[PDB]
Design a protein around this motif. Sequence first.
Motif, PDB file in Angstrom:
ATOM      1  N   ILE A  53       0.841  -1.191   0.000  1.00 26.26           N
ATOM      2  CA  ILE A  53       0.000   0.000   0.000  1.00 26.26           C
ATOM      3  C   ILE A  53       0.877   1.242   0.000  1.00 26.26           C
ATOM      4  O   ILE A  53       0.799   2.077  -0.909  1.00 26.26           O
ATOM      5  N   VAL A  54       1.817   1.310   0.943  1.00 26.00           N
ATOM      6  CA  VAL A  54       2.672   2.486   1.025  1.00 26.00           C
ATOM      7  C   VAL A  54       3.432   2.660  -0.279  1.00 26.00           C
ATOM      8  O   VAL A  54       3.430   3.740  -0.880  1.00 26.00           O
ATOM      9  N   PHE A  55       3.998   1.566  -0.791  1.00 28.26           N
ATOM     10  CA  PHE A  55       4.844   1.666  -1.968  1.00 28.26           C
ATOM     11  C   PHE A  55       4.045   2.161  -3.156  1.00 28.26           C
ATOM     12  O   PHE A  55       4.546   2.943  -3.967  1.00 28.26           O
ATOM     13  N   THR A  56       2.780   1.756  -3.257  1.00 28.90           N
ATOM     14  CA  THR A  56       2.018   2.178  -4.421  1.00 28.90           C
ATOM     15  C   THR A  56       1.561   3.615  -4.259  1.00 28.90           C
ATOM     16  O   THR A  56       1.463   4.354  -5.238  1.00 28.90           O
TER      17      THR A  56
ATOM     18  N   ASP S   2      -0.995   8.324   8.210  1.00 32.06           N
ATOM     19  CA  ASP S   2      -0.925   6.880   8.394  1.00 32.06           C
ATOM     20  C   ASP S   2      -1.880   6.227   7.407  1.00 32.06           C
ATOM     21  O   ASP S   2      -3.099   6.287   7.581  1.00 32.06           O
ATOM     22  N   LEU S   3      -1.336   5.613   6.376  1.00 34.03           N
ATOM     23  CA  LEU S   3      -2.159   5.072   5.308  1.00 34.03           C
ATOM     24  C   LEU S   3      -2.959   3.873   5.727  1.00 34.03           C
ATOM     25  O   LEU S   3      -3.789   3.418   4.950  1.00 34.03           O
ATOM     26  N   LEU S   4      -2.766   3.336   6.930  1.00 33.82           N
ATOM     27  CA  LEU S   4      -3.537   2.191   7.390  1.00 33.82           C
ATOM     28  C   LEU S   4      -4.309   2.498   8.666  1.00 33.82           C
ATOM     29  O   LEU S   4      -4.656   1.576   9.404  1.00 33.82           O
ATOM     30  N   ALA S   5      -4.591   3.773   8.934  1.00 26.64           N
ATOM     31  CA  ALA S   5      -5.248   4.146  10.182  1.00 26.64           C
ATOM     32  C   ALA S   5      -6.618   3.497  10.322  1.00 26.64           C
ATOM     33  O   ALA S   5      -6.982   3.045  11.415  1.00 26.64           O
ATOM     34  N   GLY S   6      -7.376   3.414   9.230  1.00 23.86           N
ATOM     35  CA  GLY S   6      -8.718   2.864   9.251  1.00 23.86           C
ATOM     36  C   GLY S   6      -8.827   1.462   9.809  1.00 23.86           C
ATOM     37  O   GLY S   6      -9.917   1.072  10.236  1.00 23.86           O
TER      38      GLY S   6
ATOM     39  N   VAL T  11       5.486   7.547   4.719  1.00 17.64           N
ATOM     40  CA  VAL T  11       6.217   6.412   5.270  1.00 17.64           C
ATOM     41  C   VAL T  11       6.390   6.579   6.771  1.00 17.64           C
ATOM     42  O   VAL T  11       5.998   5.710   7.558  1.00 17.64           O
ATOM     43  N   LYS T  12       6.906   7.733   7.191  1.00 22.02           N
ATOM     44  CA  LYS T  12       7.159   7.946   8.608  1.00 22.02           C
ATOM     45  C   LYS T  12       5.865   7.894   9.407  1.00 22.02           C
ATOM     46  O   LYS T  12       5.860   7.458  10.561  1.00 22.02           O
ATOM     47  N   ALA T  13       4.750   8.292   8.798  1.00 17.91           N
ATOM     48  CA  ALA T  13       3.486   8.281   9.522  1.00 17.91           C
ATOM     49  C   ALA T  13       2.888   6.882   9.571  1.00 17.91           C
ATOM     50  O   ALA T  13       2.149   6.554  10.503  1.00 17.91           O
ATOM     51  N   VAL T  21       0.569   0.101  12.593  1.00 14.18           N
ATOM     52  CA  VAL T  21       1.613  -0.919  12.665  1.00 14.18           C
ATOM     53  C   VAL T  21       2.165  -1.032  14.083  1.00 14.18           C
ATOM     54  O   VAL T  21       2.351  -2.135  14.609  1.00 14.18           O
ATOM     55  N   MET T  22       2.438   0.105  14.724  1.00 16.18           N
ATOM     56  CA  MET T  22       2.947   0.066  16.091  1.00 16.18           C
ATOM     57  C   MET T  22       1.918  -0.492  17.061  1.00 16.18           C
ATOM     58  O   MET T  22       2.272  -1.214  18.000  1.00 16.18           O
TER      59      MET T  22
END
Lengths: 64, 64, 64, 64, 64, 64, 64, 64, 64, 64, 64, 64, 64, 64, 64, 64, 64, 64, 64, 64, 64, 64
Positions: A53-56, S2-6, T11-13, T21-22
């Motif tokens: 996801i991040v990479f895209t 944060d691209l995965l916050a959801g 990325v950092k976020a 992730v954390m």
Amino acid sequence: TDLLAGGKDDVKATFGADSFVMMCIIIAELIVGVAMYIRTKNLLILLGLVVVIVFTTVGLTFIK
Amino acid sequence: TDLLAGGKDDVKATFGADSFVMMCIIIAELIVGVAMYIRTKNLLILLGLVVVIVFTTVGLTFIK
Amino acid sequence: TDLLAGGKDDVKATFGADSFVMMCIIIAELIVGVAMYIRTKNLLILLGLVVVIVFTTVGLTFIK
Amino acid sequence: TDLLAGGKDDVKATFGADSFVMMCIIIAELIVGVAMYIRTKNLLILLGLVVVIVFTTVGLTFIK
Amino acid sequence: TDLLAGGKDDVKATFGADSFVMMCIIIAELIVGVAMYIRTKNLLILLGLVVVIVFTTVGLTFIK
Amino acid sequence: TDLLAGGKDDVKATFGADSFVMMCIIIAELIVGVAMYIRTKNLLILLGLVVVIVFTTVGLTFIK
Amino acid sequence: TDLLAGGKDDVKATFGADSFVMMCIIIAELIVGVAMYIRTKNLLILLGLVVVIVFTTVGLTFIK
Amino acid sequence: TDLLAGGKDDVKATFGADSFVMMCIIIAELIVGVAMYIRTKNLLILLGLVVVIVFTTVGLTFIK
Amino acid sequence: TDLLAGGKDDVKATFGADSFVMMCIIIAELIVGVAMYIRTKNLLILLGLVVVIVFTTVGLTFIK
Amino acid sequence: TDLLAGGKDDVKATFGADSFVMMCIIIAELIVGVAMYIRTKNLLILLGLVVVIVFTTVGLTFIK
Amino acid sequence: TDLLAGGKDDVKATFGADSFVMMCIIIAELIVGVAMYIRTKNLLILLGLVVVIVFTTVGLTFIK
Amino acid sequence: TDLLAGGKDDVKATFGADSFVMMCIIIAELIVGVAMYIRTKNLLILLGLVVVIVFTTVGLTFIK
Amino acid sequence: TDLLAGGKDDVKATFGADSFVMMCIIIAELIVGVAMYIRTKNLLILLGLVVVIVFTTVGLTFIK
Amino acid sequence: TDLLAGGKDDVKATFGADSFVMMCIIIAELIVGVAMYIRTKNLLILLGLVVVIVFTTVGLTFIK
Amino acid sequence: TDLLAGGKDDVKATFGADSFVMMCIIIAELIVGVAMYIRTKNLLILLGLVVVIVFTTVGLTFIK
Amino acid sequence: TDLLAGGKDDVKATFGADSFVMMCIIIAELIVGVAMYIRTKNLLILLGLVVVIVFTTVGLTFIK
Amino acid sequence: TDLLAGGKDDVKATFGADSFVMMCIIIAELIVGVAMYIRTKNLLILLGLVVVIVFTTVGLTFIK
Amino acid sequence: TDLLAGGKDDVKATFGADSFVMMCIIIAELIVGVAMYIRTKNLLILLGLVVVIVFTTVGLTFIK
Amino acid sequence: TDLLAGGKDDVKATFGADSFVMMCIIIAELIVGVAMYIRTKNLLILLGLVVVIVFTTVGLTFIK
Amino acid sequence: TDLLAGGKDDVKATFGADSFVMMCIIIAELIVGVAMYIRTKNLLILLGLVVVIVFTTVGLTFIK
Amino acid sequence: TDLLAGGKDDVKATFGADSFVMMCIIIAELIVGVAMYIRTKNLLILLGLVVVIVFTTVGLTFIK
Amino acid sequence: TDLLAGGKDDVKATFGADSFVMMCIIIAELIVGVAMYIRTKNLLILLGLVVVIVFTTVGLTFIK
Ligand SMILES: CCCCCCCCCCCCCCCC(=O)OC[C@H](COP(=O)(O)OC[C@@H](O)CO)OC(=O)CCCCCCCCCCCCCCC
Ligand SMILES: CCCCCCCCCCCCCCCC(=O)OC[C@H](COP(=O)(O)OC[C@@H](O)CO)OC(=O)CCCCCCCCCCCCCCC
Ligand SMILES: CCCCCCCCCCCCCCCC(=O)OC[C@H](COP(=O)(O)OC[C@@H](O)CO)OC(=O)CCCCCCCCCCCCCCC
Ligand SMILES: CCCCCCCCCCCCCCCC(=O)OC[C@H](COP(=O)(O)OC[C@@H](O)CO)OC(=O)CCCCCCCCCCCCCCC
Ligand SMILES: CCCCCCCCCCCCCCCC(=O)OC[C@H](COP(=O)(O)OC[C@@H](O)CO)OC(=O)CCCCCCCCCCCCCCC
Ligand SMILES: CCCCCCCCCCCCCCCC(=O)OC[C@H](COP(=O)(O)OC[C@@H](O)CO)OC(=O)CCCCCCCCCCCCCCC
Ligand SMILES: CCCCCCCCCCCCCCCC(=O)OC[C@H](COP(=O)(O)OC[C@@H](O)CO)OC(=O)CCCCCCCCCCCCCCC
Ligand SMILES: CCCCCCCCCCCCCCCC(=O)OC[C@H](COP(=O)(O)OC[C@@H](O)CO)OC(=O)CCCCCCCCCCCCCCC
Ligand SMILES: CCCCCCCCCCCCCCCC(=O)OC[C@H](COP(=O)(O)OC[C@@H](O)CO)OC(=O)CCCCCCCCCCCCCCC
Ligand SMILES: CCCCCCCCCCCCCCCC(=O)OC[C@H](COP(=O)(O)OC[C@@H](O)CO)OC(=O)CCCCCCCCCCCCCCC
Ligand SMILES: CCCCCCCCCCCCCCCC(=O)OC[C@H](COP(=O)(O)OC[C@@H](O)CO)OC(=O)CCCCCCCCCCCCCCC
Ligand SMILES: CCCCCCCCCCCCCCCC(=O)OC[C@H](COP(=O)(O)OC[C@@H](O)CO)OC(=O)CCCCCCCCCCCCCCC
Ligand SMILES: CCCCCCCCCCCCCCCC(=O)OC[C@H](COP(=O)(O)OC[C@@H](O)CO)OC(=O)CCCCCCCCCCCCCCC
């Protein structure tokens, strides 16, 4: 000038942010990753999805 | 634009939330996990099922 | 849409609640567990059977 | 549906109540238990035989 | 079904009532018990022999 | 149909009851078992020989 | 078939009653047993030698 | 076969009655036994030496 | 339609219930299993033979 | 054929009784054995040296 | 051849009687033995040093 | 057819009983076996030499 | 032839006793050996350095 | 030649007595050793540091 | 040169006397030692802390 | 530099004087000590608490 | 045829006993073998050098 | 959300207040406790039963 | 971003305070703890349950 | 410049302080740690959670 | 000159000290290290992060 | 001559000591090495960087 400039839009839209192709790529990552996890039980492998996801997302930012 | 947008629906439905493919994936996790548990007697391995369920649910949310 | 929906029934019946496969899994748990108990004399290991039964019952509930 | 239902009978009879396999399991428990008792002189270890008998009887009840 | 029923007889005779194996087990109990008694002078330990005899007799009754 | 039926006899005789191969297997069990016993002094390990004899006899009964 | 019958004799003589291999096995039992006894002072361990002798004699009777 | 018969002599002489190895074993018994006696003051432990001598003599008689 | 129906019989007889091939498979299971048991002394491994017999019997039932 | 008979001598002398290779093997046994003994304090491990000497002597007798 | 005879001298001198390697081995025995004695207070463990000295002396005699 | 019968003799002599090749094979077994024993201290591994000798003798009997 | 004899000197000097290549080999042995020792704490591994030195010295003697 | 002699100096200085690499090696030994000691409380393990220092000093003497 | 000399400072400061790493090591020793003492009530184990402090101080002196 | 100096504060505060971790350690000492005292009635064991308090106070002084 | 007999000498001298080519082969074996040993610490691999020497000597005997 | 909430009931009923598992646990406590009492004659050990009952009752209260 | 916050909610609910997973963990602690207590009669082991409850409560507070 | 600087933020976020992730990492530590504690009853293992929290906090400080 | 000198700047900035690439590398080390620690509970593995930081800092100093 | 001598300078400057190409090579070694280390945690792999630096420096000395 660029004698092919007119072609940039459709190409960028067909391989871009909300395209069918990117959807297929994310689906593939999800399926392949969960299959790898079921086989090996290595939880870290699931982070693959995050990576993709991040990479895209970030990657598509560099496509001008 | 996306010159292949029309293809998004069926693909998303065939690899999506209530699809035959996801059912097969959950079945595979259940069988493989219980077999691993019978062999090794490591109770934590059964949490694999939980993981897979969560991963397939949340993951499918990012499929647009 | 799901272009493979028609396949859900037989699959679910062949790996489901009263299937030959689940019977084989319970038999395997019984045999392996009693063999482990005979070797190690750890009574708690017999609870493995209970675990497997519960895991296969509850687990099959999440198979849609 | 169960596409393998026809296989249930023989399997259940070969690993079931009056099978050769269960006889071998009870013999193994008897021999191993009496050997453990001769070595350690822990009388409680002989209850192992009882446990195995009960476990194989009750357990086989859950095999459908 | 029992696809291995034909094997019950010889097995039962080789680990059964008047077998070479049971003779060896009783001999072992006698020797080990008398050695323990010589070392510790605990007369009760000699009842071990009785226990083993009873355990092997009654136990072999449950081997069907 | 059986287009290879004619081959059953010699094969069955070369891996069968009074064959050179079975003699080698029993010799191997005897040597390996006595070596294990010398190292570990676990008397029960000698029953391995009995097991192998029984297993090869009864087992060869199912070879048709 | 027995296509390897001709090999039975030498094999049986090289791992048999009065062979170099059996002599080495008895020597090993004697040395290892006396070393164990010197370390632990458990007199019963010396019966190991007896066991090995008996096991190799009787055992070689079943080698046909 | 006995294809290794020629090896019996030297082996038997190197682990036999008047060998360096048996001398080392008797020395070890003497030292370890006197050390045990000095620590525990159990006079019976000195009979260990006698036992070892007898065991090595009689035992070597069964080495053919 | 079936333009190759006429071939079903011989094939089914050459890989079927009383075929040379199934005999070879059972022999292989017996030999490999007893070798594994001699090496590892894991008694449960001998159940492999049972499994194979059952698997080949029940399995051949699904061959139409 | 023997078309390579002429090669037997040098080979046999380079891997034989008084060769550099056998000297290296005995040195290795001495060093490794004394290191094992220093680490574990298992006196029996020193007999390894004896074994190797005997094994290389008697063994070289069978090299024709 | 002995095609490597010329190598015997240096090897024998580098792993031999008055070599750096043997000095290191004796030092290691001294240190490890005194550490074991400080921890366990088993006086007999100090004889380890004697053993090593003897073993390296006598042993080096068999290195030809 | 036999149009190559004339070649049997030399071949059989070059890979046969007293050939250079068999000598090399026995030497290799001796060296590799003693190296394995020095590393692992598993005495049973030395029986490898016996096995190889027997296998090459008996085996060469079946070479016609 | 020897049509390439003239090349022997430089080659022998570049891979020989006091060459840059041999220095690099000894350095590599020292570094790799001390790293292995730090990881595993197996003191014997340090003898690797000795071995390499000896092997390169004696070995270079056979380079003519 | 030695066609690569000119390279000896820098190499020897970069992996030599007062190099960055040797400093890193000593640091690694210190850290790993103190971590092992904290985990196992085996005081002898701290001598590892001494060993490494000696090994790197003396060892570097043989690097010419 | 030493082609990597410039790297010595930061490395030495990051694993050196007043570094974050050494603080973490001392904290770990304190926690692990007090936990061991609470479990076993062996007062001597608390000297571990002293040892670590000394070992890290003196040891860092040899890091040049 | 010390490239990780910035991390010292939080670490020191999380394992330091008034931290949650030290509170848990003192609680554990109190509970374990009173349980030991109830079982053994050895009053001196209660001094364990004192020891731990002192050890954690003084010890934390050396954490820089 | 022999119309090329005159060519035998130089060829045999350029690939023969004291040739530049054989020197290069022995050097290669030495270097590759010591590198393998440094990586894997398998002492037996050093015997490779011996093998090569023997193989090139004896082998060159068959070159007529 | 809790994607596995639906599984709470059966699990809680199978390991809960009036379950087969709790009955087995109380039986085990009764048998093991009376056996300990017969061996040691320590009357306080019988309070074990009370403890287990209380622990399983109160404990099951915290299972939500 | 944060691209995965959801994804945070469901995950947190499935492994959180009132989840099926936490219920299973508390059940496991109860069963394993009472089994340990029945075997060893160490009353302190029952505090394990308390620990787990506290650890899961307080611990879940740090999950943001 | 840095031709990819624009990618740093997301990325950092996504792998940073308050990311999904954390959260998953802390959940995993909690579950795995409590499972280890239930199995082994080693209270110190619960400090793992503390470690992970600290390591992820301080560590994320060095991510620029 | 250097015909490609003009390319040095951007390259050095894109793989250099404050680049997106180095940030990704440090993130990867943090995640992988904490995952390894959660699985194995080997505290020393966390020093990996320190190592990587140092290695990337000092290492980038040699990039000219 | 040398009809192409005039080309030596630029070539040597473009692939030489302070060239863009050598910078890229060192960057590649740094990145690949740290990635290998993160994956495998083999600290020795980081010495790769040192090796490359040395190899490129010394090596460029032989480029005339
Ligand atoms: C129609 C065919 C029916 C097959 C029989 C049904 C199950 C009977 C249970 C027998 C158990 C004992 C086998 C010991 C012989 C054997 O194979 O031993 C292999 C192995 C030996 O166990 P150990 O781990 O102690 O041994 C390790 C090594 O020695 C193995 O080399 O056993 C296991 O690991 C058992 C774990 C079972 C894992 C769960 C299996 C779930 C699938 C169910 C079965 C497949 C159905 C197939 C349908 C066509
Ligand atoms: C047709 C073949 C019939 C086989 C015989 C039937 C059972 C006879 C009972 C003999 C028990 C003593 C064996 C000692 C020789 C032996 O193998 O010792 C190996 C091992 C030695 O026990 P220890 O744990 O004290 O020894 C540990 C180590 O020294 C082993 O290397 O024994 C066990 O662990 C026994 C546990 C049995 C586990 C349950 C087995 C359930 C399967 C039933 C048998 C398979 C049937 C196969 C059907 C084809
Ligand atoms: C054809 C071969 C026949 C073998 C002899 C038959 C039994 C003779 C009885 C001798 C007992 C004394 C042995 C002391 C020499 C010896 O091995 O000492 C080993 C060990 C020493 O006893 P401790 O526990 O005092 O010693 C502990 C340690 O010092 C051992 O290293 O003895 C036992 O534990 C005995 C328990 C027997 C367990 C029951 C065995 C049931 C199987 C029956 C025998 C197998 C039959 C094989 C058929 C092929
Ligand atoms: C004509 C040739 C006849 C060959 C001899 C016949 C059998 C003699 C028995 C000797 C046993 C001791 C060998 C130790 C030397 C040896 O190889 O040690 C290898 C290995 C060492 O045992 P461990 O597991 O303790 O050692 C593990 C490692 O150190 C091995 O590297 O031994 C085994 O695993 C034995 C298990 C036998 C498994 C059953 C074999 C069944 C086949 C029967 C034999 C084949 C017949 C061939 C016909 C042409
Ligand atoms: C021609 C070669 C003849 C070889 C000598 C014949 C046997 C002499 C008996 C010496 C025994 C003491 C060895 C201690 C040196 C040694 O190796 O120690 C290794 C090991 C040390 O015993 P522990 O278990 O106390 O030590 C464990 C660890 O410290 C080992 O690293 O000894 C055993 O386990 C002995 C069990 C023997 C198992 C039975 C062997 C049966 C095979 C017979 C011998 C093979 C014949 C080969 C024919 C070519
Ligand atoms: C050419 C080399 C000759 C070696 C010396 C000959 C024997 C001298 C007797 C010294 C005994 C005292 C050693 C204490 C130093 C020592 O090692 O202590 C280790 C150990 C300490 O005894 P404990 O059981 O009290 O200590 C337990 C632990 O603290 C050990 O870590 O001693 C024994 O267990 C002795 C049992 C001997 C078992 C019988 C051995 C039979 C083999 C004979 C010797 C091998 C010959 C090799 C030929 C190349
Ligand atoms: C007319 C020809 C008849 C052939 C003999 C019939 C079967 C006899 C059984 C012998 C078993 C022992 C072989 C060991 C010699 C051998 O090959 O060892 C190879 C290999 C060695 O086993 P390991 O896995 O321990 O060894 C691994 C490596 O060392 C192998 O390089 O054995 C197996 O994997 C056995 C598994 C059998 C798999 C099932 C086979 C099913 C097919 C049935 C046979 C084919 C029939 C052909 C018809 C024309
Ligand atoms: C001209 C070259 C001469 C070489 C020296 C001659 C032998 C000197 C003996 C030194 C032994 C200590 C080595 C420790 C350094 C070393 O390599 O450690 C590697 C390894 C470490 O032993 P462990 O099993 O305790 O360690 C396991 C792991 O840590 C290894 O990575 O040692 C062995 O396994 C030794 C077994 C020897 C097996 C027998 C070898 C037989 C061949 C004889 C030698 C070859 C001759 C070559 C002729 C050109
Ligand atoms: C030029 C280099 C010279 C090196 C120093 C010479 C020897 C000094 C003696 C120090 C002994 C204490 C080491 C403790 C630090 C250490 O490594 O501890 C590792 C280990 C710890 O002993 P434990 O068995 O109590 O500990 C087990 C575990 O905690 C280990 O992780 O020690 C041993 O096992 C010692 C056995 C020595 C086996 C004999 C070795 C024979 C070879 C001689 C030395 C090699 C020479 C190399 C030449 C280049
Ligand atoms: C005229 C030439 C004569 C050659 C010498 C004759 C045999 C001498 C025996 C030396 C054995 C030690 C070699 C170690 C050096 C070496 O190569 O090590 C390679 C390898 C190392 O063993 P490991 O499996 O422990 O090592 C695995 C890896 O490290 C290998 O890279 O050794 C083996 O696998 C040995 C098995 C031999 C298999 C049987 C061979 C049968 C053929 C007989 C020889 C061929 C004759 C040729 C005629 C022209
Ligand atoms: C002018 C260039 C000079 C180069 C430096 C000279 C040697 C310095 C020694 C450094 C050793 C540490 C390297 C670790 C970095 C590295 O490469 O690690 C790779 C590898 C890592 O070791 P492991 O087996 O533990 O790792 C396995 C995997 O992780 C590898 O991917 O190391 C080895 O296998 C070392 C064995 C050396 C084998 C002997 C080599 C003999 C040749 C001598 C050197 C060539 C000279 C070239 C002349 C132009
Ligand atoms: C400029 C870069 C400088 C790097 C730092 C210098 C050394 C600092 C010492 C830190 C040690 C702790 C690392 C733990 C983090 C880590 O990697 O853990 C990995 C591993 C974990 O140890 P265990 O064996 O307990 O763990 C086994 C498994 O869990 C590993 O996955 O540690 C070791 O094996 C240490 C042995 C070191 C072997 C000697 C190394 C010699 C080379 C010197 C360093 C290379 C210099 C590179 C120059 C560019
Ligand atoms: C920025 C991150 C800072 C991390 C915290 C600093 C140290 C705090 C001390 C806590 C100790 C208690 C941990 C118990 C949780 C834990 O991991 O338990 C694992 C293990 C459990 O100990 P046992 O041996 O009793 O348990 C064995 C098994 O149950 C383990 O599975 O603990 C140890 O072995 C401790 C030995 C420490 C060895 C020395 C470590 C030296 C390195 C210093 C720390 C690394 C710094 C990283 C920098 C980024």
